[PDB]
Amino acid sequence: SAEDVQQEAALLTKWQRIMGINYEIVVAHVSKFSENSGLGISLEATVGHHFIRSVLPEGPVGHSGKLFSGDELLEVNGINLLGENHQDVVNILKELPIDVTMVCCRRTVP
């Protein structure tokens, strides 16, 4: 618990220092249902940014409960996604193992 908690806190802290105060950072621990299947999300993108378009309630990301449509993808299992090109993001997500730690963000207000 302590090890896990401080590791998750460090991830949050890393990406807070990268994105700044206008973003809420979220860490999700996701388990895929099989090696040969996916995350249960559709994506949309702009140049240098990738977003969750939809979360299927029945899929792995939906089962985590932490991520919502509109969230921006930042990092998965320590691999950077922010500012990468479309092909690299898609290929990185496809190659993920069963257990995935996803870092995302959403714009926020105080």
Tokens linked to 34: 């099989």
> Where does residue 55 rank: exposed (0-12), middle (13-18), buried (19+ CB within 10 A)?
buried
SS3 40: coil
SS3 23: strand
* CA–CA separation, 21 and 1 (whole Å): 27
71 touches 77 (CB < 8 A): no
- E strands, the chain, are 23-31, 41-46, 49-55, 72-76, 79-80, 99-107
Q: What method was applied to determine this entry?
A: X-ray
SS3 34: coil
* CA–CA separation, 28 and 47 (whole Å): 24
Structure resolution, Å = 1.6
Q: Fill in the DSSP letter of residue 77.
A: T
